[PDB]
């Protein structure tokens, strides 16, 4: 069992925080917010670094390039923006979605960005040019999450339509549609680190690990509350192998991936924990909460 303990509370976003992510080089945490801003913080000391501004409406997601130099952000202003972190410059504004952009991610080579939108589409963008390369007719309801696999050859998407879909990056073809009894809205999805599984959150207070190729649910994680928000989930791999998620009861939940038992609940946020992130090399977790709290917390364990 881990022993995550609070180390720092990071404050100053003026509205709900939407997403927190650690830079791949482990040096930084980036946060996005309904306040239309991105903030950068020291990953190990929680020290505020800088604010990055330019979106015209709130931002629901942010993601780092593999070399930790760029960010992409997804906004209700219907665009994504690519940012040079050290200069703060907006390098490109990605236009094409017809509604809120909700989620985003770079591929491992970082030459592509994938986005999902309330317009029900998934779009694949060229980083260098800013051009949309493909528009996938992915879902029949808002797209809640998009993620590339370890070698970038696949994209997984999730939707309120109750489905998770696997896409061939090169062709745009849908290679798989995952179906689960009752088709509860899917609020989050991501590949496992080895790319063999996908972790999916549904708005019925449940997280599941799936062997998507075979359409077999291998694990189910419950105990938390998730019925209204798209809460991030994660695979913790620097120490023990955990599943980490936020929750609508203001707690961070940690489960043993194999046993499915809850091994820790982290307390002291005062609103829904919308986002959690796991450091790439240290046993550190970042968490972020909604409007009534607006703080980010950094927790650290010995294992």
């Amino acid at each position: 069992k881990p022993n995550y303990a609070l180390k720092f509370t990071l404050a100053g976003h003026t509205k709900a925080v939407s997403s927190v992510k650690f830079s791949p080089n482990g040096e930084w945490l980036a946060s996005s917010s309904a306040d239309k801003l991105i903030k950068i913080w020291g990953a190990y000391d929680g020290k505020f670094e800088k604010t990055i501004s330019g979106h015209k409406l709130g931002i629901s997601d942010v993601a780092w390039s593999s070399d930790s130099n760029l960010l992409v952000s997804a906004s209700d202003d219907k665009t994504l923006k690519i940012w040079d972190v050290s200069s703060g410059k907006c390098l490109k504004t990605l236009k094409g979605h017809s509604n809120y952009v909700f989620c985003c991610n770079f591929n491992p080579q970082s030459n592509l960005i994938v986005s999902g939108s309330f317009d029900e589409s998934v779009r694949i963008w060229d980083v260098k040019t800013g051009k949309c390369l493909k528009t996938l007719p992915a879902h029949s309801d808002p797209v809640s999450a998009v993620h590339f696999n370890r070698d970038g050859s696949l994209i997984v998407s999730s939707s309120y339509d109750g489905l998770c879909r696997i896409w061939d990056t090169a062709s745009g073809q849908c290679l798989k549609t995952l179906i689960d009894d009752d088709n509860p809205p899917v609020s989050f999805v991501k590949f496992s680190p080895n790319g063999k599984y996908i972790l999916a959150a549904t708005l019925d207070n449940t997280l599941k690990l799936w062997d998507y190729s075979k359409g077999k649910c291998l694990k189910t994680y419950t105990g938390h509350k998730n019925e209204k928000y798209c809460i991030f989930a994660n695979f913790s791999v620097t120490g023990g192998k955990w599943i980490v998620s936020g929750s609508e009861d203001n707690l961070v939940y940690i489960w043993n991936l194999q046993t499915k038992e809850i091994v820790q609940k982290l307390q002291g946020h005062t609103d829904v924990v919308i986002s959690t992130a796991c450091h790439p090399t240290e046993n550190i977790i970042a968490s972020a909460a909604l409007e009534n709290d607006k703080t980010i917390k950094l927790w650290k364990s010995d294992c």
Partner: peptide, 10 residues
Amino acid sequence: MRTEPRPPAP
């Protein structure tokens, strides 16, 4: 916004 809730189905 992700920060705003989806009314659960009735």
